[PDB]
Amino acid sequence: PTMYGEILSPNYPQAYPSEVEKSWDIEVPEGYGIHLYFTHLDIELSENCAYDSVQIISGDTEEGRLCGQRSSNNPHSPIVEEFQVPYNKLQVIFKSDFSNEERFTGFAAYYVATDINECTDPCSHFCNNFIGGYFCSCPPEYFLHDDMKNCGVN
């Protein structure tokens, strides 16, 4: 597990090679989600991103598929695209086909581990969230049971 990281296309920041298939596995600790944001996108554009693409894949699901050349028009933020998953595992797959004649320079993305708010998103009386988990608390009369979930009088 890891709290943060970076994913760059092959040969970044220069042009990526052709006929290339690369994969990255993102893992953060339990109790954490993943926020993955792209700060650079320069990829050959095609319909449905069927030639060159970046696939963001969750468990047996496709979170996203990116191609083309985009950048932020916000002066206060360099983020082009972003994904926020409530899981501790993610996959990034970069695919490049036969020809890169136009010399596209690929992508640059970063991910960080976010905290799951288990109380907003589990306790009989009071849920207190903390970074990486939660605990349950009770009014001054009740006591916590052995399951650490339910409270009752003595």
Epitope: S71, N73, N74, S77, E81
Partner: antibody, heavy 113, light 110 residues
Framework: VQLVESGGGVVQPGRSLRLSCAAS????????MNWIRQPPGKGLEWIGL???????FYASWAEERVTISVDQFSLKLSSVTAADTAVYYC??????????????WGQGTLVTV | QMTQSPSSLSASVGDRVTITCQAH????????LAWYQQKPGQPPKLLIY???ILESGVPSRFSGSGSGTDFTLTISSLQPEDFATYYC?????????????FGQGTKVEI
């Protein structure tokens, strides 16, 4: 996804103009959000935007007279003149930090002065 | 910022329509130009974005093209439902005027 606006009516000149818009099926914090207006018989005129991160930008003719807020998506226009009567639209951009197009529009509230 | 030509155009059903837009600056990402179609009493409908990409559900007669400053919308075959007003919309990089600007419009009549 859907956008619905409200607040359209008759307003005396010099008074205040406030319009509101509610989304349906998406959150306002993930897309760049725009106010546009169209005078009767005239063309479309971009008023302003707020990006998903939360930064508000305005047109040159409205940088001193307009405040755009997110909560909801509200537009506030002061010193309302007989030139401010128009159908006001709310629109959504393609991404968070750029527009590139408006694919999801509202319905448009007519405001008379 | 945006100059759309012509202001109006009259053509019969089945002819080709050309509408030009000039930005006088470089668009954001060099290609952030959208084309919309509006009918009376209705909001505008996005036809084209990124200066060439047709939106889902748009007939194939509509076409887009253009370089950094000059852009063109083409209707290869007019239809009874193609008579409306058309707008170009440009996104511009921060620090060069307004972020977004619409063209004057072009009303098409039989």
């Amino acid at each position: 996804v859907q956008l619905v606006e409200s607040g359209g009516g008759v307003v005396q000149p010099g008074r205040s103009l406030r319009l509101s818009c509610a989304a349906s099926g998406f959150t306002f914090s993930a897309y760049a959000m725009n106010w546009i207006r169209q005078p009767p018989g005239k063309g479309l005129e971009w008023i302003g935007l707020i990006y998903g991160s939360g930064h508000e930008f305005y047109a040159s003719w409205a940088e001193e007279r307009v405040t755009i807020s997110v909560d909801q998506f509200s537009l506030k226009l002061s010193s309302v003149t007989a030139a401010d009567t128009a159908v006001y639209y709310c629109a959504r951009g393609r991404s968070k930090n750029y527009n590139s197009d408006f694919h999801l529009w509202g319905q448009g509230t007519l405001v008379t002065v | 910022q945006m100059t759309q030509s012509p202001s109006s155009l009259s053509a019969s059903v089945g002819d080709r329509v050309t509408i030009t837009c000039q930005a006088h600056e470089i668009l954001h990402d060099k290609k952030n130009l959208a084309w919309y179609q509006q009918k009376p009493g209705q909001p505008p409908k996005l036809l084209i974005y990124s200066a060439s990409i047709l939106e889902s559900g748009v007939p194939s007669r509509f076409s887009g093209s253009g370089s950094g400053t000059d852009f063109t919308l083409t209707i290869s075959s007019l239809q009874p439902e193609d008579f409306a007003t058309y707008y170009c919309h440009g996104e511009f990089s921060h620090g060069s005027g307004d972020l977004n600007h619409f063209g004057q419009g072009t009303k098409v009549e039989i």
